Ligand binder design. Structure first.
Ligand code: HEM
Length: 376
């Protein structure tokens, strides 16, 4: 199982299933990590911050204070910055946020109307919508789209540095570049928007800046890839949009689309205290990679796991994580995807495949390089 093999990148889910069917907790000796593909096992590890952690300092690893961030802190320190970010999130009026998200999606869809040739929905919709959406929420001017994607691409590829260590350095350079952008916004941001509210709430300055950088990039990188993957499914299966289109029906549809096309394929933890996971005893110091995308296809929990089923129980999928580190933006992301579905229906356009979906060579975060379609 080479996670970056071209055949795996083309469609990793049959490989996930082969792993899950043989052992829900495999030891990957070359990555020196457990590979967890079972739903119960991923859900266990994600919620148990007592025995499994994200702060490597809890296994005696030196981490400078300048590099601490919400995603690499565990309780009790995690609660302060986490609460700060949630407070700033909850100060944003949702009527304004939904109007902004709906306008952005509609504007970029209308720009596709009348395109006689082939259009790439990744670069023409998923990425610009995600970038304007996150910066609108943050209350800051959008950076150059092509330039920002170059930085983000380097960062996303660096998440696979455990597989290809050469990917680390381009990511460090892109991270430092996003740091300067966040520093400018902190000094200059309007009182309106998430940045202004975070600043007021504030926690050491380095934790705040690093956490805002995570909000920015986690938002852009995840939303753009979620939209790309959802769009790829909709173009092949337009019947998914021909449903009741009520608020409750769309709630179920959106939940399934996130379960199936949630872009996070791998979510890592370190074992702080020995604990059984699946059939295995995991040991303090062991790294675990939770294949949460694979867990979301576990047939024990999601019968007909590769299909949209509109009658499943809500609150099951792990695409937003679970527990203390559950996605800060899960509500924003679901709201945003809901508005995209509404914009597609109101646009009336017919998007037909004009070539194969092509995927980037990224294993931790799954993303399309291109989604060629015909606007109609
Ligand atoms: C506006 C959109 C988004 C924002 C602002 C955002 C931001 C964040 C932040 C700051 C965290 C860290 C929370 C913490 O460590 O306490 C996080 C976690 C996470 N996000 Fe999001 N995110 C967004 C969208 C998404 C989407 C669309 C997905 C996948 C469908 C996703 C998947 C995840 C997951 C799985 C985690 C958990 C990581 C872990 O277990 O440590 N996010 N997000």
């Amino acid at each position: 199982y080479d996670p970056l093999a071209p055949s795996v990148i083309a469609d990793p889910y049959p490989f996930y299933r082969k792993l899950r069917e043989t052992n829900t907790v495999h030891w990957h000796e070359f990555l020196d990590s457990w590979v967890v593909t079972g739903y119960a096992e991923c859900r266990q590890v994600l919620g148990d911050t007592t025995n499994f952690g994200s702060d490597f300092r809890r296994i005696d690893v030196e981490i400078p204070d300048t590099q601490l961030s919400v995603q690499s802190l565990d309780p009790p320190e995690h609660g302060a910055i986490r609460h700060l970010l949630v407070s700033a999130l909850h100060e944003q009026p949702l009527s304004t946020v939904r109007q902004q998200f709906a306008a952005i999606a509609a504007q970029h869809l209308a720009e596709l109307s009348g395109q006689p040739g082939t259009v790439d929905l990744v670069s023409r919709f998923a990425r610009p919508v995600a970038l304007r959406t996150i910066t609108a929420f943050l209350g800051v001017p959008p950076p150059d789209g092509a330039g920002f994607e170059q930085w983000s691409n380097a960062i996303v590829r660096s998440m696979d540095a455990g597989i290809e260590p050469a990917r680390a350095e381009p990511g460090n350079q892109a991270r430092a570049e996003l740091s300067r952008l966040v520093t400018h916004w902190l000094a200059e941001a309007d009182e309106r928007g998430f940045v202004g509210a975070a600043r007021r709430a504030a926690v050491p300055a380095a934790v705040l800046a690093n956490s805002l950088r995570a909000v920015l990039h986690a938002g852009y990188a995840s939303v753009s890839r979620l939209l790309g993957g959802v769009l790829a499914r909709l173009v092949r299966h337009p019947e998914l949009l021909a449903g009741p289109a009520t608020r409750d029906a769309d709630e179920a549809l959106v939940d399934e689309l996130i379960r199936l096309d949630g872009p996070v394929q791998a979510d890592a933890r370190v074992c702080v205290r020995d604990q059984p996971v699946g059939a295995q005893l995991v040991r303090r110091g062991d790294v675990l990679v939770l294949f949460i995308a694979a867990a979301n296809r576990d047939p024990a929990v999601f019968p007909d796991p590769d299909a949209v089923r509109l009658t499943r129980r809500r609150g099951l999928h792990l695409a937003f994580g679970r527990g203390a580190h559950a996605c800060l933006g899960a509500g924003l992301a679901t709201l945003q995807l809901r508005e995209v579905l509404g914009a597609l229906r109101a646009g009336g356009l017919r998007l037909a495949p004009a070539g194969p979906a092509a995927y980037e060579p990224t294993a931790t975060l799954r993303g399309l390089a291109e989604l060629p379609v015909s606007v109609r």
